Amino acid sequence: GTSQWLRKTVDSAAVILFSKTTCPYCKKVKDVLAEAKIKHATIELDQLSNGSAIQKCLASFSKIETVPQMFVRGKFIGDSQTVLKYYSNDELAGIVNESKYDYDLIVIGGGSGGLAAGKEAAKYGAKTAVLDYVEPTPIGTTWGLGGTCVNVGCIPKKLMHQAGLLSHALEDAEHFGWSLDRSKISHNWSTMVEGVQSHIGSLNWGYKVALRDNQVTYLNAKGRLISPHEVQITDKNQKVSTITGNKIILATGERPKYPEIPGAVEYGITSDDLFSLPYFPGKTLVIGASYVALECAGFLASLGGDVTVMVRSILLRGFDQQMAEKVGDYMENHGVKFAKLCVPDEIKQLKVVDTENNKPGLLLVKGHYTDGKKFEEEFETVIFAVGREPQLSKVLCETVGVKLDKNGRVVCTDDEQTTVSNVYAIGDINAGKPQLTPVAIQAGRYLARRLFAGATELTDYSNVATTVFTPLEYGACGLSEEDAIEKYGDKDIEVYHSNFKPLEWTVAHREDNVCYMKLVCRKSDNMRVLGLHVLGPNAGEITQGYAVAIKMGATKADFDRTIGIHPTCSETFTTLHVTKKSGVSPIVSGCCG
Amino acid sequence: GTSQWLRKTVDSAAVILFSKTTCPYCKKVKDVLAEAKIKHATIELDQLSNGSAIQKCLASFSKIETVPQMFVRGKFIGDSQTVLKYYSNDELAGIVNESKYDYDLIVIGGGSGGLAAGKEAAKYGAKTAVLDYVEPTPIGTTWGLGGTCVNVGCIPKKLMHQAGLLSHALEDAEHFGWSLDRSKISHNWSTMVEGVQSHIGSLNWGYKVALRDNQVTYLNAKGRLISPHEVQITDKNQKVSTITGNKIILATGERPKYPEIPGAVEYGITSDDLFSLPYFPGKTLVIGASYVALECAGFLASLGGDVTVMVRSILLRGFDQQMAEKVGDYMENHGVKFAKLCVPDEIKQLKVVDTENNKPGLLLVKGHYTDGKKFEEEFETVIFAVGREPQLSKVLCETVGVKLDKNGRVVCTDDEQTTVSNVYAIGDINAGKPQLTPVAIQAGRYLARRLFAGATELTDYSNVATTVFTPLEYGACGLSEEDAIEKYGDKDIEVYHSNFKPLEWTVAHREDNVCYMKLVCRKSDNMRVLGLHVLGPNAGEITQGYAVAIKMGATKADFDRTIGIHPTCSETFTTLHVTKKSGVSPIVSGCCG
Ligand SMILES: Cc1cc2nc3c(=O)[nH]c(=O)nc-3n(C[C@H](O)[C@H](O)[C@H](O)COP(=O)(O)OP(=O)(O)OC[C@H]3O[C@@H](n4cnc5c(N)ncnc54)[C@H](O)[C@@H]3O)c2cc1C
Ligand SMILES: Cc1cc2nc3c(=O)[nH]c(=O)nc-3n(C[C@H](O)[C@H](O)[C@H](O)COP(=O)(O)OP(=O)(O)OC[C@H]3O[C@@H](n4cnc5c(N)ncnc54)[C@H](O)[C@@H]3O)c2cc1C
Ligand SMILES: Cc1ccc2c(=O)c(C(=O)O)c[nH]c2n1
Ligand SMILES: Cc1ccc2c(=O)c(C(=O)O)c[nH]c2n1
Ligand SMILES: [Cl-]
Ligand SMILES: [Cl-]
Ligand SMILES: [K+]
Ligand SMILES: [K+]
Ligand code: NA
Ligand code: NA
């Protein structure tokens, strides 16, 4: 494997130094490169099992087996005397910048994965360009650099969730002795949006400064891959040019879908519009049942809004259905209405949005239930959350040879490579992968290290933990109970479970036996934890550290031997004893023995 | 080991059935015992490696090698035909109740460890008594069943911490768009105390009902161990009697210390008095620097109080000192004053506590700094938090032979056994063990299983995670950085670290580069995580799941291969890259690449 690894490494690296930690010739070259501000990867062969073997293999490229060896874009450029000769003769800049292509890397898409890949690549002396363009929504909404999460996803949705959580905090503060009257306090949408948008603007700016400080070229331009090494760019002036790159990372993400019904595009909005909406949504219908649908419905209700969710079938398809039902039950018991087994037929406009007074319009939504009854109700705002899709026909010419799946996602190897060998795809467009920001970031950073620094480490997409930021949050890592049973059979599955009550809920007079957790375990594999699930406050904080234990193959016994931190919600994972098979109730009292 | 285990098991178990899961004779006995409401342990030999060997060993006690075999208090009572003979002849009640002693177990102390041990023992048919008495504080404060944590510890302190956290929640809610004016809202101490005390009363009651429902005898009586099997009890009427028990668990905990200075006992208070204080503490001096001192100072300041902490030397001795300094810096920057390098000499009374209007008194505290300057300041309340101590001379007669250490704590084996072989000690009085509620609970429950159900599992006291519930919380698991360096040497330690900023702090305009985390790792052991440390909100929820990974031997690579949950504070543990040895700043901007 050594010679194949060295061939791949040398071919792809922009600027790389084969070195040893203790070699003074290696230091003289490093000091020259640092003095010349020449960024590069370094492989210290004295720190590798197969270092002796890599030294021998290097003579296939350079005819030498000594360190240091410096390579540029697939070519041996010199030992220490040669690199110091180019430096002293003012030749070294020209040599380290020599390329068949404008860039070593072009990243098409300036979101979670693309920015992480481009910044990481630049660290190893890849000459990098990041392209980002935000096609406006149908009402004309656009935003700055950073992608879906930063501008219209995780960041603003979690901030608006925090605004919603602070309602319950106002309520609780009265029971804890604070002299405020919750009933007299109102929420101002636009004040909140201004604060969220100021934060997002600081991120848009921060990314532009980070790219400038890493010597990455940022182009606010729509990129189209027209051949393996050619990207056509279209700038704001509609000026069309071609730039060339050695490696191409496709990181273009997805955008909301609309249903094909009259008035949906004209009169509804999506999450892309919600997070900067200049008017308060008012009485709101959310059509959909994804995590986006429920998160948005939930914070809007907690802000004091009249909210209905129109559900075609089930909530949170693909997540553990027991947990999904508990998530929705909590919502229904806390001010969210559900129109169940219901689909929309038409959106009719009753009032146009008021762009001066910043007031919503008014819409008539017609739909129907599975039982044949009509749905007909007025809403000020209608939010579609009915899926997301890539729009790669925009992004790649069909003649380039990048294989897509039946959903228009990119078919990749376990190292993110497409069917075009210099072209990789990361993030939400990579078929089959969890569509999450930290997944796109790890994939992009690890890929950049493989391309430009001879790393071997792949991204592990297994047992990737999630959290749904509904009013009562839901954290999970691993299999749903139903998927565990389908895979291993019911007789090989043991489920430990318990209700719990946050201590913070006691004096606040909140619910007993609503927060809930379970461990789905495999009996024949030492009670291996296949899936962890928790409904409760701060569920992402609870779940994250257990992800490390599950990656390590935690068993039930590993959870039991660990001592709780008291008083916490998370400690309940360390004392679970009630099995589903026993039929014993998972309910709990305050204190027992 | 089998014959030694079987000898110990048979001698100690109150009522035990040796069984196999598939034996219909075993079922007939189980159904009779369940019908007669006779509780017992069961060992299913078909579920043990050495089951075949245990069957053979059983003939040393019973002369038979078949199942079922039923034992009572060290004696073989019968096979299936014999047990059904006693039942049919109304003899079985008398036989299963036959004992040399009043109880199989007497627990002296009805706190975290004792209640957990007694309830667990009762499950296996141990006839159990729990003794609890609360000696009043010097001002006369007392409370109900449940121990330090429930009444004057973790439970009320965390509830008053939540009351304090809700101040910052009121502040934040304005930036998130809520129309309240933080400056107009005040806190009412006594309203809060009423709520906390109502919760505590529900726990006191819950424990009494749980003991009644497990057929445990609860005596509100002071117990004194006068010989290995004899406990002298003194009831509220000062009636003195003796009860006898086979096994004795000492679970009597600790109480606050006072310094030997004039006025301390007469005019100061401790945490024992604070949690039910009927008057608002007002301007408060906390003398001490333990976690109790800082937690209490912190919530009192967040409630709007004028608070000073008098520190003799350092904060949080025994915890990582870098983290301790950050904890205190946050406090000092958020309304806690520190009188550093300062000790008290005298407390003078200026006003008596007002018991009708529920107002504090007034005190003059005289002390001195190491620099020779005098301290002289008025306070309404003075809280001593200057350690806790066991008071076992009260609890055990010196003639019984239970060895204590130089601090008056019980010297125990790794299975909680004292120098008196039937007498065990759990919780805060067990020398050398972390003084934590979940430690006392695991120790007590696991011990009861070893005594009464033939369990072998010991409590693991290593890498027990903690959280200090200061205004900015501090969670830890494993070694401090300084202890890791002392043990392994500086050259074998790598520390990864980062600041972070909760997303919830962005729109709220709270601090950059104050929350902080680090992993202290051992270079020569695959970068094993020796210690994890986090300063930030919800730090107990963050830290708990990583405790499971650390118990499993997590390395840095295990943290890196795990994918973050976004947006959370905890995810920062999955991307740490900056080492202390590098000298690179741990500060972070919002968004970089
Ligand atoms: C409402 C919502 C909430 C979410 N909440 C969370 C959450 O809490 N946690 C979580 O982990 N994930 C969350 N996600 C998912 C997360 O946003 C995505 O997984 C992540 O943004 C995907 O990153 P990416 O790099 O694949 O694409 P994106 O971040 O979508 O970035 C792609 C970028 O490329 C641009 N682009 C597209 N075509 C071109 C072109 N031809 N040329 C130039 N630029 C182009 C796009 O406009 C965009 O700026 C959420 C998503 C949504 C919609
Ligand atoms: C202010 C404070 C905050 C704390 N916060 C936390 C925290 O957040 N998390 C955590 O894990 N730990 C915390 N602790 C520690 C925790 O309270 C203890 O570790 C735990 O209560 C110890 O349990 P135990 O069973 O050893 O003793 P205890 O709970 O102290 O119970 C001993 C009981 O026995 C009684 N007793 C004593 N002598 C006799 C006698 N002769 N006969 C009869 N009864 C007797 C005592 O009065 C008491 O009721 C805190 C402690 C304090 C003081
Ligand atoms: C509940 C309900 C039902 C029908 C209508 C309607 O036709 C209409 C209009 O202006 O067309 C306005 N509002 C309506 N509201
Ligand atoms: C700051 C300060 C210093 C001294 C005294 C004092 O002697 C006193 C008294 O009544 O004795 C009351 N209050 C005081 N306050
Ligand atoms: Cl921008
Ligand atoms: Cl009581
Ligand atoms: K445990
Ligand atoms: K990671
Ligand atoms: Na265990
Ligand atoms: Na990794």
Give, for B520, the enclosing helix (H) or strand (E).
Answer: strand B515-522
Residue type, A324: A
Which residue pairs from A403-410 have beta carbons closer than 8 angstroms and sit at least 24 positions apart in sequence? A404/A431, A405/A431, A407/A431, A410/A250
Q: Structure tokens of A292? A: 């986006």
What is the rounded CA–CA span in Å between residue A183 and residue B24? 65
- In terms of CA atoms, which chain A residue is nearest residue B178? A187
Question: Which residue's CA is the closest to the ligand 3 atom numbered 2?
Answer: A377
Ligand 2: which atom is nearest the Cα of residue B395?
A: 41
What is the rounded CA–CA span in Å between residue B142 and residue B133? 9
What is the rounded CA–CA span in Å between residue A286 and residue A306? 11
User: Is the bond preceding A567 in cis, omega lying within 30 degrees of 0?
Assistant: yes
Cβ contact (<8 Å) for A563 and B466? no
What is the rounded CA–CA span in Å between residue B409 and residue B430? 6
Q: How far is CA A14 from the centre of its chain?
A: 28
Cβ atoms of residues B416 and B105 within 8 Å: no
What is the rounded CA–CA span in Å between residue A431 and residue A454? 25
Instruction: Select from A407, A232, A593, A397 the least CA-distant residue to B126.
Output: A593
A545: nearest CB among B187, B543, B563: B543
- In whole angstroms, how far apart are CA B362 and each of A580, B281, B347, B382? 58, 10, 10, 9
What is the rounded CA–CA span in Å between residue B12 and residue A81? 81
* CB distance A131 to ligand 1 below 6 Å: yes
Cβ atoms of residues A535 and A326 within 8 Å: yes
Cα dihedral A426, A429, A430, A434 in deg (nearest 10):
90
Phi and psi at residue B210, to the nearest 5°: -65, -40
**Sequence-ordered alpha helix ranges (H) in A303-337:** 321-333
- In whole angstroms, how far apart are CA B404 and each of A206, B108, B391, B396, B401? 61, 17, 11, 10, 9
Phi and psi at residue B213, to the nearest 5°: -75, -20
Cβ atoms of residues B444 and B120 within 8 Å: yes
What is the rounded CA–CA span in Å between residue B144 and residue B146? 7
**Please, is B411 exposed, middle or buried when counting C-beta atoms within 10 Å of its C-beta (0-12, 13-18, 19+)?**
middle
What is the rounded CA–CA span in Å between residue A135 and residue A255? 9
Residue A560, annotated as binding a ligand:
yes
Residue type, A196: V
Instruction: Select from A304, A290, A293 the least CA-distant residue to A334.
Output: A304
Cβ contact (<8 Å) for A438 and B566? yes
Q: Structure tokens of B90? A: 């109304």
Cβ atoms of residues A216 and A126 within 8 Å: no
Q: How far is CA A157 from the centre of its chain?
A: 13
What is the rounded CA–CA span in Å between residue B495 and residue B477? 15
Options A229, A334, A566, A577, the catalytic residue? A566
Give, for B42, the enclosing helix (H) or strand (E).
Answer: strand B41-44
Q: What is the DSSP string of B342-396?
A: EEEEEEEEEE--BTTTTB--EEEEEEEETTSPEEEEEESEEEE-S-EEE-GGGTB
Cβ atoms of residues A348 and A367 within 8 Å: no
DSSP state of A118: H
Q: How many CA atoms lie within 13 A of B389 on its CB side?
A: 13
What is the rounded CA–CA span in Å between residue B574 and residue B472? 21
**Please, is A46 exposed, middle or buried when counting C-beta atoms within 10 Å of its C-beta (0-12, 13-18, 19+)?**
middle
Residue type, A304: G
- In terms of CA atoms, which chain A residue is nearest residue B116? A593
Q: How far is CA B206 from the centre of its chain?
A: 19
Phi and psi at residue B201, to the nearest 5°: -60, -35
Give, for A249, the enclosing helix (H) or strand (E).
Answer: strand A240-250
Q: Structure tokens of B492? A: 């074998």
What is the rounded CA–CA span in Å between residue A422 and residue A249? 9
* Domain ranges across chain A: 1-100, 101-256+387-462, 257-386, 463-593
Cβ atoms of residues A511 and A505 within 8 Å: yes
What is the rounded CA–CA span in Å between residue B104 and residue B120? 13
Cβ atoms of residues B245 and B107 within 8 Å: no
Cα angle: A335, vertex A339, A345; to 5 degrees: 135
Give, for B30, the enclosing helix (H) or strand (E).
Answer: helix B24-35
Q: How far is CA B94 from the centre of its chain?
A: 39
Cβ atoms of residues A29 and A20 within 8 Å: no
Q: Structure tokens of A360? A: 């919503």
DSSP state of A528: E
DSSP state of A490: G
Q: Are β-strands A217-219 and A128-131 bridged in parallel, bridged antiparallel, or unpaired?
A: parallel
Q: Structure tokens of B226? A: 């006068």
Q: Structure tokens of B553? A: 């031997």
**Residues with Cβ within 8 Å of residue B214, at least 6 apart in sequence:** A593, B118, B119, B122, B123, B128
Cα dihedral B438, B444, B448, B450 in deg (nearest 10):
80
Cβ atoms of residues A443 and A427 within 8 Å: yes
**Residues with Cβ within 8 Å of residue A157, at least 6 apart in sequence:** A271, A275, A292, A295, A296, A299, A469
How long a stretch of residues is chain A?
Answer: 593
Give, for B309, the enclosing helix (H) or strand (E).
Answer: strand B307-311
Experimental approach: X-ray
Ligand 1: which atom is nearest the Cα of residue A391?
A: 38
What is the rounded CA–CA span in Å between residue B496 and residue B586? 9
The B336-340 sheet, strands edge to edge: B336-340, B307-311, B284-287, B381-384
DSSP state of B134: -
Tell me the sheet residues that pair with A223. A233
Phi and psi at residue A188, to the nearest 5°: -110, 105
| Resolution expressed in Å | 1.5
Helices A291-302 and A154-175, axial angle in degrees (round to 10): 40
Helices B154-175 and A154-175, axial angle in degrees (round to 10): 120
CB atoms within 10 A of CB A187: 20
Cβ atoms of residues A143 and A204 within 8 Å: yes
Cβ contact (<8 Å) for A166 and B178? yes
**Residues with Cβ within 8 Å of residue A209, at least 6 apart in sequence:** none
What is the rounded CA–CA span in Å between residue B56 and residue B67? 11
Give, for B206, the enclosing helix (H) or strand (E).
Answer: helix B189-213
First to last CA, chain B: 59
Tell me the sheet residues that pair with A41. A16
First to last CA, chain A: 59
Question: Which residue's CA is the closest to the ligand 2 atom numbered 30?
Answer: B253
What is the rounded CA–CA span in Å between residue A507 and residue B197? 9
Q: Are β-strands B103-108 and B240-250 bridged in parallel, bridged antiparallel, or unpaired?
A: parallel
What is the rounded CA–CA span in Å between residue A497 and residue A429? 36
DSSP state of A565: P
* CB distance B223 to ligand 2 below 6 Å: yes
**For chain B, what is the largest distance between any 2 Cα atoms, rounded to a whole number of angstroms?**
85
**Residues with Cβ within 8 Å of residue B77, at least 6 apart in sequence:** B70, B71, B83, B86, B95, B96
How long a stretch of residues is chain B?
Answer: 593
- In whole angstroms, how far apart are CA B121 and each of A571, A576, A586, B99, B454? 23, 18, 22, 16, 12
What is the rounded CA–CA span in Å between residue A274 and residue A286? 11
Considering every ligand atom shown, identify the ligand nearest to the alpha carbon of residue A364 and give its number: 3
A438: nearest CB among B169, B538, B564: B564
Phi and psi at residue A467, to the nearest 5°: -145, 135
Instruction: Select from B439, B440, B445 the least CA-distant residue to B465.
Output: B439
What is the rounded CA–CA span in Å between residue B242 and residue B225? 10
What is the rounded CA–CA span in Å between residue A38 and residue B149? 60
CB atoms within 10 A of CB B11: 12
What is the rounded CA–CA span in Å between residue B570 and residue B534? 9
What is the rounded CA–CA span in Å between residue A498 and residue A29? 61
User: Is the bond preceding A68 in cis, omega lying within 30 degrees of 0?
Assistant: yes
What is the rounded CA–CA span in Å between residue A251 and residue B593? 14
Instruction: Select from B253, B562, B285 the least CA-distant residue to B436.
Output: B253
Instruction: Select from B155, B101, B103, B157 the least CA-distant residue to B126.
Output: B103
Which residue pairs from A135-142 have beta carbons closer than 8 angstroms and sit at least 24 positions apart in sequence? A135/A222, A135/A255, A135/A394, A137/A269, A137/A270, A137/A272, A137/A273, A138/A265, A138/A266, A139/A269, A139/A273, A141/A272, A141/A273, A141/A276
Instruction: Select from A337, A371, A436 the least CA-distant residue to B571.
Output: A436
Cα angle: A129, vertex A130, A131; to 5 degrees: 115
Residue A456, annotated as binding a ligand:
no
Cα dihedral A125, A440, B475, B496 in deg (nearest 10):
-20
**Please, is B47 exposed, middle or buried when counting C-beta atoms within 10 Å of its C-beta (0-12, 13-18, 19+)?**
exposed
- In whole angstroms, how far apart are CA A515 and each of A149, A232, A535, A569, B121? 28, 52, 5, 9, 29
3-state secondary structure of B467: strand
**Residues with Cβ within 8 Å of residue A448, at least 6 apart in sequence:** A105, A116, A117, A118, A120, A121, A123, A124, A126
Judging contacts by C-beta atoms under 8 Å, the chain A residues touching residue B526 are none
* CB distance A288 to ligand 1 below 6 Å: no
Strands (E), B362-487: 362-369, 374-379, 381-384, 388-390, 423-425, 466-468, 474-478
Cα angle: A192, vertex A198, A199; to 5 degrees: 95
What is the rounded CA–CA span in Å between residue B257 and residue B387? 6
B507: nearest CB among A159, A538, A554: A159
- In terms of CA atoms, which chain A residue is nearest residue B439? A563
- In whole angstroms, how far apart are CA A531 and each of A483, A518, A551, B1, B574? 10, 8, 11, 36, 20
What is the rounded CA–CA span in Å between residue B539 and residue B562? 19
Phi and psi at residue A21, to the nearest 5°: -70, -25
**Residues with Cβ within 8 Å of residue B180, at least 6 apart in sequence:** A170, A180, A185, B170, B173, B174
**Residues with Cβ within 8 Å of residue B195, at least 6 apart in sequence:** A175, A176, A177, A507, B159
Q: Are β-strands B423-425 and B240-250 bridged in parallel, bridged antiparallel, or unpaired?
A: parallel
**Active-site residue set of B:** 566
Instruction: Select from B293, B284, B343 the least CA-distant residue to B317.
Output: B293
Give, for A197, the enclosing helix (H) or strand (E).
Answer: helix A189-213
Residue type, B356: E
